[PDB]
Write an enzyme that holds these catalytic residues in place. Sequence first.
Site, short mmCIF file in Angstrom:
data_model
loop_
_atom_site.label_atom_id
_atom_site.label_comp_id
_atom_site.label_asym_id
_atom_site.label_seq_id
_atom_site.Cartn_x
_atom_site.Cartn_y
_atom_site.Cartn_z
CE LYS D 117 -4.49 -1.46 1.58
NZ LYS D 117 -5.69 -0.94 2.28
CD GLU D 201 -3.40 6.83 4.15
OE1 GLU D 201 -2.36 6.98 3.46
OE2 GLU D 201 -4.49 6.45 3.66
CG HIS D 236 -12.32 0.14 8.24
ND1 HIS D 236 -13.03 1.29 8.49
CD2 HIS D 236 -11.49 -0.03 9.30
CE1 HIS D 236 -12.64 1.81 9.64
NE2 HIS D 236 -11.70 1.03 10.15
CE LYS D 238 -14.96 -2.22 -1.47
NZ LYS D 238 -14.58 -2.80 -2.77
#
Lengths: 86, 627, 181, 246
Positions: D117, D201, D236, D238
């Site tokens: 990533k 982040e 996180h 779907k």
Amino acid sequence: NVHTNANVKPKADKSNPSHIGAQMPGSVTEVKVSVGETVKANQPLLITEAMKMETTIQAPFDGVIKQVTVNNGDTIATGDLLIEIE
Amino acid sequence: PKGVAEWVKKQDDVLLTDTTFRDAHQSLLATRVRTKDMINIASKTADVFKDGFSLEMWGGATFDVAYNFLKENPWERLERLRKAIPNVLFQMLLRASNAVGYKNYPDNVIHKFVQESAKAGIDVFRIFDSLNWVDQMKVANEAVQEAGKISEGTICYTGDILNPERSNIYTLEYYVKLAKELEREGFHILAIKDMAGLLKPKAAYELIGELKSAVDLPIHLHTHDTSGNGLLTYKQAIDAGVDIIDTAVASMSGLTSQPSANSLYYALNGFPRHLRTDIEGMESLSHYWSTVRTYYSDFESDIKSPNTEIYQHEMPGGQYSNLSQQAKSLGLGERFDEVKDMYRRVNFLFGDIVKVTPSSKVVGDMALYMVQNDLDEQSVITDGYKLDFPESVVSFFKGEIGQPVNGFNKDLQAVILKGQEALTARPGEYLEPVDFEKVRELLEEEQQGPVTEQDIISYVLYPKVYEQYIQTRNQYGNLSLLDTPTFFFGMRNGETVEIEIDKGKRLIIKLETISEPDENGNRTIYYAMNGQARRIYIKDENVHTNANVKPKADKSNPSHIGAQMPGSVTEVKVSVGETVKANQPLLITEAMKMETTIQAPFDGVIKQVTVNNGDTIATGDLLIEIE
Amino acid sequence: ELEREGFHILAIKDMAGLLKPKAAYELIGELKSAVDLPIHLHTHDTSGNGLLTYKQAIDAGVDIIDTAVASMSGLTSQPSANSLYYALNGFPRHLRTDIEGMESLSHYWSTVRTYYSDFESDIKSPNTEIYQHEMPGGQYSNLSQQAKSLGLGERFDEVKDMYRRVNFLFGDIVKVTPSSK
Amino acid sequence: QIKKLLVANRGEIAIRIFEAAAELDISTVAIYSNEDKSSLHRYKADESYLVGSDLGPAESYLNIERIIDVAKQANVDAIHPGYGFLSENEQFARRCAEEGIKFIGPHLEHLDMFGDKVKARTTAIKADLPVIPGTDGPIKSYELAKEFAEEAGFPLMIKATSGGGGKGMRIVREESELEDAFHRAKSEAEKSFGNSEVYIERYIDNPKHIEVQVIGDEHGNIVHLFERDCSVQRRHQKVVEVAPSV
Ligand SMILES: Nc1ncnc2c1ncn2[C@@H]1O[C@H](COP(=O)(O)OP(=O)(O)OP(=O)(O)O)[C@@H](O)[C@H]1O
Ligand SMILES: O=CCCCC[C@@H]1SC[C@@H]2NC(=O)N[C@@H]21
Ligand SMILES: [Cl-]
Ligand SMILES: [Mn+2]
Ligand SMILES: [Mn+2]
């Protein structure tokens, strides 16, 4: 007619030449003779059915059928008397 | 071929031909062993017998028994095994007169057969005449020569060379004469087929000794262990220089089978010459065959002991008990000693002949016949004009199996034949060639279309059986891929079976349950077949159709007649699709020793009849429909 | 030693059928010089080489051999007398007995043996693995019921192998009843 | 030129591939493991093959070597990896080319490029795309951690250094509970994925997750087939997706 194959044949006398016994277990498909009929050596007497296989029982010599122990669709064990001949 | 043989002669070791795929189960299990079970150990077998001379895996009864009893293509068995075992010679047994069939054939049938058998994998043809008549052996031999394969020239053994009082004919000098002669016919290998295990140990030693001296060809010995002296025989054959011997794995060996290769292996420890094989892998082969053999319990031979009465009467192979079974069918079971004795006497009555399929059936037939008709060597001739000899023996005296070593008794023949001419020449010479084209024409018209050469001779060889194999194949497809237990038994409730079709193509089948029979003797089977539910309908044969379940009459429907009470069908009276008037008798029932005749409510066309004579019935059962 | 002890006859008892033909020749050969006792030899045809062991021993001068009637012979029994009688045709020494009577006895025992079918063993084939493990007459199959009778009958491969090993572990012993138990 | 096809996968997607395959007159090969032994997808190809009985539970759709050998046994031209097993695996596709078989997906370099990533983010920055602040690379220790934490902002999220399953992430709102985060979600990114390389982040508040579908050929042509809104997530993760976005 409550039992039809639950009649008990006697056992062939193994040391009597005129006694014909069953050689293995199974089924009478077709009686082909009566008490009294004369027959020739090797004549069809009886069609049995073993395990989906048809065996034809034959006169051993020439002579006279004296008792016939079975009816179409009776069951038989090794050793059961099937026919007397003279 | 020439070169192979030269090679063999050099070998110090005793080479071996394994008979497990052919002769062993032909003797022990009525030739019933399926392709499936052969195929599963073919890769192991290739390793074990890597240095074996050959595997006998074809011929004898296998052709006709595969197509007939097991419903599988003997051609596939060969082609599959051939692909799996690419390194050992494949050998078959080929009777000179008719290759693998049941009759006599024109020569072009022999040729086409050997041609296709060569093509599909067979490397060694053991050619044998059932009367040691060399002349009948020339057609097969040529066909093998032109095919480039190995032609094995066979002498069958009878009599007893140790005993000068046994025969003046079957002597050391006869066998030497025959071998030298087979050599000039240019066979690559001399085979000695001791079909009845008559070759006593010293005899083998004296006999092979002489042949090794007499011919430059390599010698291939074949015997059965039915006297219990098989290993001894091979042991002596080995001291005398024999090149190849026919063996089976321990668990498919013994009695009327080949001598045990596992035993022979250890028996030889400490002696000059050494069997050339892997025992480590034959113990392994043995264990496999021992388990598989159990699948075949219903066809176990009757025989369970050595029998030395073989040396008097000489009944090859299994015959000494099929004939006993056969004697029991004719009231002679208490007199089997008289048959064993007539067997021998009939041999001499016939000139003293070699006894293998089909000559041994001849002798057996006569013996049964003579005891049955209180007959002897004199009266057979005296009363012969009014006797109906067995068709097999008239065939023999007509020349139709071939020419016996010693000729025919001219008087005996007269009496058996009753005028009919005998053949002056070997049976195949009389016959028109088969038009193979006309055969393709037909087979292609009967079938899809595309039909091969193996289809063609298969049909010529075995018209009826072939035809039938084909009906079976149309009905059920490729039976040969079922594992033997499934093939013989089907499945039990709850079982999952896993049929291998191809690399990465299997059918996973589960049997769930079976229904009781509907009014017609049909049971519904519920399977699952890879991932999907499936239902199948099969006809039961009851023994007594009182088991069958009848649907219930729709009560608010005037067409359905119902059972007003329990009872029995005493008589069926009308049939499906047939006219009746109001108030007609159409079914007689019995309640409790009481008649009553169920009659039609209106004028009708009988739609259905859910009953036969002597069927059980319960209240509310649909007996009839009418329009 | 046994000669010294005043035994009238020396018997070689080959309980596991391990006396290979050549061995039989050389063992009876030597014993015939070594001592003055006649030699009485006993074997089991469990490997399938019993008759061969007999023939070799006979060449070597054996005096008496234990045989059985054809129909009660072979596999784990003794070798067939009927078979040996003929096996010896053409060789120096002949088996003293009545074949015709022996054929007659065989037939008798054939039918009689039928009365006992509930008692036959599964053993139906010669087995030359006896030379690796050395289990005497019965055992091999006995010791198989017992191994399934405790859920090890899926690796009798290893029992057989442990049997051999146990043997050497115990310093390598003679194995008949009761040492084989 | 594609004649056999193997799917290194199970279930709906496997079957889906098998459908297209047949539709293109390509023969199909399925793989299956011990408890999949009943899985529909195994019965829905032309050939099916057990993948190492030696293998274990779920770790057997993952056995590169044992699966390529199966492909080789049936002469397979091409492997479709579906999604979610070896589909994102570097080497798998390398061993495919190394053995004459066409891995059905992106070029080797592509799997490496997005195979991680950070690289993904670096490759993006070079393609000049907007991207989430965070860190120049991975983060061991915790000294590494506290630094950027008391520097730029405070809603921040530490997260796995790869894999498309949102299991190993965790969000830091306030001063202190930062402690846990790093570790809690370091070696719970362990049990989920291979390892537990993790970075941090910005944590963007109240976002929508929009993804774009791309397809390209082997001759430099690339189209997109629009967006999907994948914002309805439990973890996180779907749960419901819409195309195109509303
Ligand atoms: N920096 C971030 N700020 C806020 N939420 C985030 C952040 N990164 C990830 N998420 C949440 O996690 C979801 C997906 O995370 P990520 O992009 O790592 O996907 P993944 O776990 O690799 O699998 P996929 O993206 O295929 O669902 C996003 O939809 C979002 O809800
Ligand atoms: O007959 C009842 C069941 C059907 C079995 C058919 C098998 S096919 C092979 C074997 N040979 C036959 O002619 N029938 C059985
Ligand atoms: Cl010897
Ligand atoms: Mn034979
Ligand atoms: Mn003993």
